Amino acid sequence: KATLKSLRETKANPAVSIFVKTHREHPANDQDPIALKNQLKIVEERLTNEFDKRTATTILDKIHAETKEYNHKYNLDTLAIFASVDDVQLIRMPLDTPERVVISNRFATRDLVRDMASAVHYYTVVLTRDKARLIEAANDRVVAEFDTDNAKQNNMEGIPFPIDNNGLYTTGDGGSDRSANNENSYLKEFFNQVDKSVQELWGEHKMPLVIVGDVRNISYYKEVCDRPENIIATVSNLTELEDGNAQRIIDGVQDAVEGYRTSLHEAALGEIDKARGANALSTDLQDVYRAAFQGAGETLYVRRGYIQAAKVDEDAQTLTMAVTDDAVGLIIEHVINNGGKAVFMPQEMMSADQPIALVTRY
Amino acid sequence: MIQVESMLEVADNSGARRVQCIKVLGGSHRRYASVGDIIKVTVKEAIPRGRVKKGDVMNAVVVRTKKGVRRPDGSVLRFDDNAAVLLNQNKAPIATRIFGPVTRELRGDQFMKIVSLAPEVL
């Protein structure tokens, strides 16, 4: 059970979630073993205090049987351990979380939820005066390259990718002269055909696209695009457009992808304001928890690191200030479980005085 | 009569010494700025460790011109230099001292601060 679709459904007791700040490079990862030891120390002490020593010992030996072969030279940003009385699942995440221990019925999966909510799937259109390429990219990896062996190009009414610019002027025949200065018009029409192929492929999937290429090529394409509202980013400082591989292109578009995610988080503020005006936004922790538990909330807006402990009972729907170690984690779990959405807004865009908001369904 | 690419002295202590007009504001094809008219400037010469630095693009108001300003009786009033006072984003003065005289065309609401801080007003 290494996935979010299994952690939320393994409802053990006690369910122990341990988070360790790890490092990818040396000697920063030199203190990763010590951090792991300290987190397991507090885990053992709390488990003995809250439960029996036998159930602390079985859990800790199970964690140790899996962490004894851990290589700390291959650590990502966070090491998450999900331990039970019977199973232990440890996963490495490129997300940064604050080191903590959560002992509850369910596994603390708000970091997995945030990582999945930050997911961006997009197209990369790589332009050149000589060719066009199309890549499908998920977050920071290439999904596919759109070459000859693909299903999405089987039944195509346009030129399939990779598209060569075999214009009559490029080969030197066809009925045109260089003294006519038609080259810009030729580039515009070639990019128009490229956009035709892009739209044909996009109609079956409908994801935002990033335009990569020279500034002039991007210009011509933007003026020629049939659906220019779906364009979310343009990068003109990416190198080796014709020979570099898809992973290299996706590596080079990551700054623009992050800027796009930031723009989405900025846009979320307007919807929060609309809910506040319509009287459908709850910002108190008690009200937010009650609405989330009774399934009244459609969107949650957390401040990306707003952990809070409280006394929560699901009988009178009360939340008194400190117990549950992550009351915000419980709110996120209820919102997700009742078919809602969770948005983890950045700190510089959501105030620390009001770090949680809930757009309710009524 | 100040147009784009004309240089101006700075009649204030914002830190700038010379500014260059890069836009006469207030109209599609507007040609000249006289005294009291708002211009976009680039700072070409700034005092070390001042508030503005060389290359800032900001607002200024023309305060004196070599071409001169006309008066209702038909008199003209000419200065030996073209000078400007730097403004903030809301077109409000950013200085606390004014150098040299100004004219009464700055009288009003926004540039009353320049008028009150000027050594002499004509």
């Binding site: 506040r276 009287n279 936004l281 709850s282 910002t283 108190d284 922790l285 008690q286 009200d287 009178a316 009360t318 939340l319 008194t320 200030m321 009001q354 009524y362 | -």
Partner: protein
């Protein structure tokens, strides 16, 4: 007595720390012994002048927007929210009983009712402060439009006494009004 909510805190070299506001009661004069009661512990000072528009004033009385110098006190030991009271006139409190009237949807307010454990913002004179509402024993809900006597626990002390009105917001949207009926300890 004399009371002035502190609005702005700045300083003049040679003269000292000037705390401008609006005098709501009494008068202030050069030599008056005063106290700063509010967010932090009470600090006892003396008045060394009153001015307005960079001009010395004869005396500042209730109604005008006068500013006042404080003797010795520095400009990080006073902040917007405390009040310059006359010694012993008022006391800094964090627990009280109110006559809170919850706004209804028609006037703004909310659809949801106030419930015990709710921590809205409390606007006393010229300062907001988080405070937990504790409904009087025998009640777990307060519908909008009603008006009941609850007990408020502020996070940090606010100078107040029985009679002071205040507003309860939840984001800049007013969700209730109230008047302190009794201060506790």
């Amino acid at each position: 007595a004399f009371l002035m909510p502190i609005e702005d805190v700045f300083s003049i070299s040679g003269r000292g720390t000037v705390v401008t506001g609006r005098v709501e009661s009494g008068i202030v004069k050069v030599g008056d012994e005063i106290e700063i009661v509010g967010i932090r512990d009470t600090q006892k000072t003396t008045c060394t002048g009153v001015e307005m528009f960079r001009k010395l004033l004869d005396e500042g009385r209730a109604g005008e927007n006068c500013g006042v110098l404080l003797r010795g006190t520095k400009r990080e030991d006073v902040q917007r929210g405390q009040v310059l009271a006359k010694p012993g006139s008022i006391t800094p409190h964090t627990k009280f009983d109110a006559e809170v009237y919850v706004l209804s949807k028609e006037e703004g307010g909310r659809h949801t009712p106030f419930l015990n454990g709710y921590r809205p913002q409390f606007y006393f004179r010229t300062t907001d402060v988080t405070g937990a509402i504790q409904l009087q024993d025998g009640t777990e809900m307060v519908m909008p439009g009603d008006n009941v006597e609850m007990g408020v626990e502020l996070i940090h002390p606010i100078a107040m006494d029985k009679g002071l009105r205040f507003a309860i917001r939840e984001g800049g949207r007013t969700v209730g009004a109230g008047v302190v009926a009794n201060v506790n300890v």
